[PDB]
Amino acid sequence: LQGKYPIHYKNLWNQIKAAIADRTMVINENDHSEFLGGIGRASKKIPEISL
Amino acid sequence: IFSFLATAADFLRKENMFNEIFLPDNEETIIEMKKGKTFLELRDESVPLPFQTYEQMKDYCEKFKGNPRELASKVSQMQSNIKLPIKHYEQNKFRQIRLPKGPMAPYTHKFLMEEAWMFTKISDPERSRAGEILIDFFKKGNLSAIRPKDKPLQGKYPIHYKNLWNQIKAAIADRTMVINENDHSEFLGGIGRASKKIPEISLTQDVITTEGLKQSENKLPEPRSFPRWFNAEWMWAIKDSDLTGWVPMAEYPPADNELEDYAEHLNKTMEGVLQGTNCAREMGKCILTVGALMTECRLFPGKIKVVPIYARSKERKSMQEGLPVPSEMDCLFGICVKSKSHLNKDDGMYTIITFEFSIREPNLEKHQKYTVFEAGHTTVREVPLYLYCRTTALSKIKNDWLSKARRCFITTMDTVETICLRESAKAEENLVEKTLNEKQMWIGKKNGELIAQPLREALRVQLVQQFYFCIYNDSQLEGFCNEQKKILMALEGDKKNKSSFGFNPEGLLEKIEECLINNPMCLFMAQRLNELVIEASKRGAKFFK
Amino acid sequence: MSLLLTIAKEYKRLCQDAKAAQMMTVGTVSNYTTFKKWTTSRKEKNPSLRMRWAMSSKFPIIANKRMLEEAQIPKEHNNVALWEDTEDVSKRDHVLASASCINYWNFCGPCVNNSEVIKEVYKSRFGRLERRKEIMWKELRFTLVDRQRRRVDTQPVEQRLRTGEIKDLQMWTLFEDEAPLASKFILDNYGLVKEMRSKFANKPLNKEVVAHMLEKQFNPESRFLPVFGAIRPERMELIHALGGETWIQEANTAGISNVDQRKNDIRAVCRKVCLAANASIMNAKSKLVEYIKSTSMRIGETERKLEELILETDDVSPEVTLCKSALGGQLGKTLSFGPMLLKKISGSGVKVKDTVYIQGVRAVQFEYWSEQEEFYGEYKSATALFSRKERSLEWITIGGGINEDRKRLLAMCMIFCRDGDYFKDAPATITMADLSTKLGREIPYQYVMMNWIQKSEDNLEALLYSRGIVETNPGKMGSSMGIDGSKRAIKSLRAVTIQSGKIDMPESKEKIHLELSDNLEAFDSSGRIVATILDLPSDKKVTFQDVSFQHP
Amino acid sequence: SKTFAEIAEAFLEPEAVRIAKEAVEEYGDHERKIIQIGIHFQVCCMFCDE
Amino acid sequence: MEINPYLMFLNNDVTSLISTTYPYTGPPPMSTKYTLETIKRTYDYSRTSVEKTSKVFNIPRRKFCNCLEDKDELVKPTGNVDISSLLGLAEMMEKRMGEGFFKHCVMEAETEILKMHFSRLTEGRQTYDWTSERNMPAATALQLTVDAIKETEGPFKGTTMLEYCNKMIEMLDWKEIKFKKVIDSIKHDEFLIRALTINTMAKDGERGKLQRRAIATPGMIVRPFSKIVETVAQKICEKLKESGLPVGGNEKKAKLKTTVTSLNARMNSDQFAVNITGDNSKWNECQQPEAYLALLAYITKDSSDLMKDLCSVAPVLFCNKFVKLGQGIRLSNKRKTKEVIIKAEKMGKYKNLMREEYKNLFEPLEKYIQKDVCFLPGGMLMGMFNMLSTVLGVSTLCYMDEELKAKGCFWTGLQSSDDFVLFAVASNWSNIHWTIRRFNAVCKLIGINMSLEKSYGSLPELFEFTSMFFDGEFVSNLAMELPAFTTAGVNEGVDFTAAMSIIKTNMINNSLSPSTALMALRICLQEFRATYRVHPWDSRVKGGRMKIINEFIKTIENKDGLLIADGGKLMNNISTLHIPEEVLKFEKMDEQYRNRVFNPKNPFTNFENEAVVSTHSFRTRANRTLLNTDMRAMMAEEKRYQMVCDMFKSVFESADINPPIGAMSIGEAIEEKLLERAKMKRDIGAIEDSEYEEIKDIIRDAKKARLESR
Amino acid sequence: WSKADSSKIYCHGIAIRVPLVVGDEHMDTSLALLEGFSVCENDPRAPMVTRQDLIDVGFGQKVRLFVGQGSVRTFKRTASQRAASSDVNKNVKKIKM
RNA sequence: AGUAGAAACAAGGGCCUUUU
């Protein structure tokens, strides 16, 4: 109805159900979580000496 | 059982196999081509020589066995009675090309580029059609101030041209871009000079003997010499034009990633560099004039019209000081006229006429076809005035292609971006501005020495090259540019110490020199190719002096 | 209604003629298709020039007449000509109309209640758009790229089907009155049809367009393209904006379209059932077929039968191959020797017998092929092009990027060609127990040496040493490979060439109908083996979700 | 496609396909007749009905 | 200063700039003299003089095959063939590829030829009708031939290709044929000659080789057999790796690269390789149709007895073909005021009032000549058989001998039609030369010559193939496709998406760079705006389309959702080339405008075609020059068929989507469906018993009339 | 179960395919009766009807009907659960002896 | 006149076939 990145949330919900089925709360694949955690800030870094 | 059969029948009917072929009865189980009588009579007649019936050939082919020894023997025999020559270029060098001899190749383009003079005004968005601006420029009085004289410096049929110019002025005054059919226009427009037909059923020997009706003796074009005015135009079309925005262009869309930013930046640099040249104004002129002429030919055939030769541009941008927001400008170089473009079929021809303005006296060799008149004076101070006038024609194809003259930009951008990206990848770093400002590209000779300028300024040479390819395109230039590649590949092989070879280079030189006739571009590029191989002989083999 | 009566009157008038009657009486209905071609046949060479010349006129288009009258479309608003009563020669029921007339309708004209149905008609392209919007771009860099050419899919599609399964679906959703007999695909996939039918029902629409769009919605566009990096349809659809020969626009696109998960699940299930049937000794064939038909799985919302998906996919794995063989499903000419991939380019041959002594004197038969044959080979992040000649690896070239993968590919290739002395005199370490017959099922020495290599790295090193070693001649230093897998050394292996840049995967649009044995080893009109059960992982435990193993 | 056998496999059981194939090979007749025979054979099967 | 464009070729490569030479930025350029010269060269390259006499036509028939004579200047073309060598090379190729190969291919072909419908002959380039003697499309020619067959003996009930072929065969043995016209009939000999007749067209759409300035146009009695032969040739060629004719682009590049890797890996340290760029000459003038017949007979030896008879038709037909002289000569006086026009059949009369060249070229070809046609018993033509010639050529690259190995020498390569590339290997130049001469000889033995001027060689990695120059890298010419980025000329919706798709394909394959793609996008946008006489809204332009724009613009909140054809701006870029604008702007469009544009009932809307449909998807006006010409009688039957088809479709809406099938005729289905709908409505819908009964009476009366008329 | 897929029943995760013989409130458009009908010998006496009145017939009755295009047949509301696989597979095993 | 090429146009049929 109203949202931004529905596909990530949906796939993540499926992965959550899968993990619970496996009796382990862990999530191995890191594609959606990585994105949604890096949306805030993520980039490279150049040393000052290489400037 | 019925359900299965229904499904199967539907499938087959869908596959077009629901016929006797796949579903025959007991009897109709022998399908065969209905070999008639005539077809057999022929098949037994088209057989190779040793056989005389298809049966013998079939029996010889179905049982044919391989005998490598006789095959090798015939191979060697044919290999001995041939004596295929092999010629390593290093030993057998390439002579220079032999250009034809005779008068010089004159100007051929419909419009003038270097000798062209134009009157300018400011553009109002309301009045923007061609039939309006041609009047706006007419009111101020300069277009009417012109008044040539009956004494031409050169040319022929000056009376017709003078009367036509007067009629043009009159029609403009009448606010109707139309002209009447008189003897003069009829002579200049080839109105009634179409052949008259004579059926053979109505023919006899007495008629033939009366007026000779032999087979037409085609008068192929005649040769020419090297033009000495081409380098002048090439050097003039490299400098600025005091304005820009000569060629209209669309807008740039938004951007979200670095890629589109890079693309937009580079495209802006190149477009800003190119829109200021002189070749650009000629491109825009051709575009707009051809658009107007095509519209007229589509709407008002069988009617002599009046179309201007104009263009639109924008004065350059000075600093914020002074008057900001520079204005636009409509420029007018001359007048054009069509003649009953009844384009019944593609490749047709509709004669036109060109009245252009200049301030530079002519040359007999170059401005051979024109018929110049001394008009008067014009300001800048006062200076004399000339009126170049000639006649020519066009067609649908040339119109459509000239209107589509914005491909040179694409080609040049491709070349440049390719070079820059290749240089940037070998080092894994953004090397584009440096490659444009630093990388030197040899562009000519002066005082027997070589000359060089960054790529940022050499783009103009490639742009003019593409424009000329678009202008002087013909079968001759086609064959030339198709047959010169061998020389370039041999040159590259020489640069890399690759021992190239060939079978008959003399024939290649002959084929090349065969398509060099009365087309300035071919002659110029051939002479330049000779100069190239000469200058490289100082650093490479496979070329004779 | 009255329209129906008019159609009847027209049919009567038309039958009154003789030729129309003869043609509507003779033959079947299919003739219509033919009649559809002899009419309205006219083309043009350069529609560009023609279009410009044509649109230049003052009424260049055609258009319906009654639709304009009903739409109260006038012939002017503030003095601009919109259409004029007249008749085109072809249609005879159309009138020449202006370009300005179209603009008139859109700006002010006949409004409609809603149009969101479009989003369903062109769902694939809105999906493209959404997938794009959910991307997080990154920096841009310049460098050279190793773009390998290969056949891939560019259109992400769920429930990929055939063509015969579509020509029917386009009817039960749109033209049900004109529907044919119910096919099995319908009776099986009922909910799918119901869904596709719920949206395009009781709507004003042009149906031909919908059918065309549905074809696109169920067509994976397969192309032979250069590619770099991972292989996923989500990327191939916009590869043009990710990298070229000299540039790369980094961007993360991993968490979208959830495609490869379905394929890996399918392959896991195939492996499971293959092992299960292998547990048998005399009916593994029928056991496997039963396990197949006794199983189903969920895709998104719908439940599909396994055997139906298997015949739609194109995963060339030693598991899917076996299944598709049991069900008589044709497939491509692609091999499989353990984890690696292989494909024959040219050559021929025939089986031949030879023997080897395992420990002391223990004769064991092993076979090998006769004349020279070329092969392309593909291991993880590594490519190779080699040739075999009479039980020997003649030459090989590699274009990979890793040392370990290079060495493993080389070893598996050497094995595939039975090159070396080990195949002439096996090592002492192996014994009759490791030979074969876990429970009776024999094993050719090939896979024996395979597992012997996978066991310890030192077996691999010894095997490589079995290949000739020499001193790296000058110049060839770059095109040389050591024992560790280094692009250059002072002493390198024999008959080897290295290079940077993968090999272009070959291509062939061919199909073959193969079979298999009671030991789960497929054959292709020859003594060659394309798949088996020894080339797959031994075993592993997994919990399958949304599956139905309706078998005891 | 590409062969009548693959076609027949579309709506027939591959078993009867192979059967009719071996049969036409026995009589050495044109392999375009795989279909009719397979159909007849399958009919016989579904006529037994166990 | 003096300015030379070519100096940049010193400090830079040549491939990365070769595009600069191609003058594809300008218009390209555009009889009987050409045809007569072609006939002469064909009769000459048949280096012999043996001749027979056809009992059918009573015409001299030079025999061009296994009759080689005049073994001088063999470097020049020759059209004589030694069948033995051809069969040997074919056998060697089969041996390489394995047994059961040709049989498998002919089987795959027969698997299609039988089920094929005879309506697939409508697709293709123009053909030469044998009634009006002019070049019409294939559909109309097929229609006329069928109508003639029917008017002669009876309607053609056939529905596949085989029956049509058998009917053609029978028609070659009839004695009187009828056909429609403003209803002339003809005899056997005249129809035979008029069927074997072939015409020429000066299209040569592609620039390519300027030498190509014509193309063939056979009749309708030769199309199906030609299709059969092309099908088998394709099934053969696809299996081979030494051919690149059917594939396009990346495929042949990968082929060449794999070949180069294999070469560099095979040759030892004491060997060196070489490349060659070849361009055969007179390809369509040396390929003899008799060798093709013998080869197809050798191929169709183990297959069924049916294919043996079909493949053998087109060869003999090309062995007895006639050519058509076009437009004759033109006569005129000195001043050129008057002008007479003359046709071919008359040139034999006024042969004295022509230039001496025409006389020397015409009088010799006066016995082979008949009325406005020549009896060419051999040779070939352009476009007729491309794949078969490619197969015949690849047979050479497969050659091997004891001598080549005694010296450690061997060649391979890759050939398409009249264009090949060679890779020879040996240990010394003295042997390289011998190998190349051996290759040239074996190619000469089958009429495959080579052009010594356009052909050159060099060290391994420097060559060209089909406008693609090859080195360590691969240079996309990028000018070969320059005409592609343009408004096709179909409608407004489409051209823009098509251009964006083309740009995407270029960027993917031809390595087109980003900024170049952006420039091309803007250029195509400008040309689109200019062609359809449309421009934006903020722009100062005033005009017809633009008047109402400024009028109604006040009603709009945001102009970002508008379309280009309705005064919209550009919202698209590299990352959005695979998305039409109609889809990208859907969220922005103000609500009212969106409903009007996608309102389904639109007057102009008329439906690869990866595009959206809307009001802008219109159809252009139709030409009217024919209005004056009396080509109207033919329009009648077309109008009849169209009425029938559109009525059937009015009844059945899915006729186009799903091809109709069944055992009923058209009238039966129509009647039954009408009654069904009538009942379905009268039961519940708004219909009266009176209306139902009236409909039923009308239908039964129409049925009675249909069955009574005939 | 769900109204979306009215042809399935989920018990303990396992799925069960319900035949299509009758159509209740949820099911849709005469696609839920097709497994109850079958083809039979043509009978010109039985009536010809539409695809919507097809629900008002009695189990075991006959009726003529129009199918697709240019095709008429006769149907009977009696099913046949047996397939050909088993019948072909089992019968072929009784021949290799 | 002119175009362009290795032949064709320089209207053809009986009145018809205007905005960067």
UniProtKB/Swiss-Prot annotation, chain A:
<comment type="subunit">
    <text>Influenza RNA polymerase is composed of three subunits: PB1, PB2 and PA. Interacts (via C-terminus) with PB1 (via N-terminus).</text>
</comment>
<comment type="function">
    <text>Plays an essential role in viral RNA transcription and replication by forming the heterotrimeric polymerase complex together with PB1 and PB2 subunits. The complex transcribes viral mRNAs by using a unique mechanism called cap-snatching. It consists in the hijacking and cleavage of host capped pre-mRNAs. These short capped RNAs are then used as primers for viral mRNAs. The PB2 subunit is responsible for the binding of the 5' cap of cellular pre-mRNAs which are subsequently cleaved after 10-13 nucleotides by the PA subunit that carries the endonuclease activity.</text>
</comment>
<comment type="similarity">
    <text>Belongs to the influenza viruses PA family.</text>
</comment>
<protein>
    <recommendedName>
        <fullName>Polymerase acidic protein</fullName>
    </recommendedName>
</protein>
From Swiss-Prot, chain C:
<comment type="similarity">
    <text>Belongs to the influenza viruses PB2 family.</text>
</comment>
<keyword id="KW-0506">mRNA capping</keyword>
<keyword id="KW-1262">Eukaryotic host gene expression shutoff by virus</keyword>
<keyword id="KW-1104">Inhibition of host RNA polymerase II by virus</keyword>
<keyword id="KW-1157">Cap snatching</keyword>
<dbReference type="GO" id="GO:0044423">
    <property type="term" value="C:virion component"/>
</dbReference>
<keyword id="KW-1191">Eukaryotic host transcription shutoff by virus</keyword>
<dbReference type="GO" id="GO:0003968">
    <property type="term" value="F:RNA-directed RNA polymerase activity"/>
</dbReference>
<keyword id="KW-0507">mRNA processing</keyword>
<protein>
    <recommendedName>
        <fullName>Polymerase basic protein 2</fullName>
    </recommendedName>
</protein>
<dbReference type="GO" id="GO:0039523">
    <property type="term" value="P:symbiont-mediated suppression of host mRNA transcription via inhibition of RNA polymerase II activity"/>
</dbReference>
<dbReference type="GO" id="GO:0006370">
    <property type="term" value="P:7-methylguanosine mRNA capping"/>
</dbReference>
<keyword id="KW-0946">Virion</keyword>
<comment type="subunit">
    <text>Influenza RNA polymerase is composed of three subunits: PB1, PB2 and PA. Interacts (via N-terminus) with PB1 (via C-terminus). Interacts with nucleoprotein NP (via N-terminus). Interacts with host ANP32A (via C-terminus); this interaction promotes viral RNA synthesis.</text>
</comment>
<dbReference type="GO" id="GO:0039694">
    <property type="term" value="P:viral RNA genome replication"/>
</dbReference>
Swiss-Prot record, chain E:
<feature type="region of interest" description="Promoter-binding site">
    <location>
        <begin position="223"/>
        <end position="230"/>
    </location>
</feature>
<comment type="subunit">
    <text>Influenza RNA polymerase is composed of three subunits: PB1, PB2 and PA. Interacts (via N-terminus) with PA (via C-terminus). Interacts (via C-terminus) with PB2 (via N-terminus); this interaction is essential for transcription initiation.</text>
</comment>
<dbReference type="GO" id="GO:0006351">
    <property type="term" value="P:DNA-templated transcription"/>
</dbReference>
<keyword id="KW-0597">Phosphoprotein</keyword>
<keyword id="KW-1190">Host gene expression shutoff by virus</keyword>
<keyword id="KW-1262">Eukaryotic host gene expression shutoff by virus</keyword>
<dbReference type="GO" id="GO:0003968">
    <property type="term" value="F:RNA-directed RNA polymerase activity"/>
</dbReference>
<dbReference type="GO" id="GO:0039657">
    <property type="term" value="P:symbiont-mediated suppression of host gene expression"/>
</dbReference>
<dbReference type="GO" id="GO:0030430">
    <property type="term" value="C:host cell cytoplasm"/>
</dbReference>
<dbReference type="InterPro" id="IPR001407">
    <property type="entry name" value="RNA_pol_PB1_influenza"/>
</dbReference>
<dbReference type="GO" id="GO:0019083">
    <property type="term" value="P:viral transcription"/>
</dbReference>
<keyword id="KW-0547">Nucleotide-binding</keyword>
<dbReference type="GO" id="GO:0042025">
    <property type="term" value="C:host cell nucleus"/>
</dbReference>
<keyword id="KW-0548">Nucleotidyltransferase</keyword>
<dbReference type="GO" id="GO:0003723">
    <property type="term" value="F:RNA binding"/>
</dbReference>
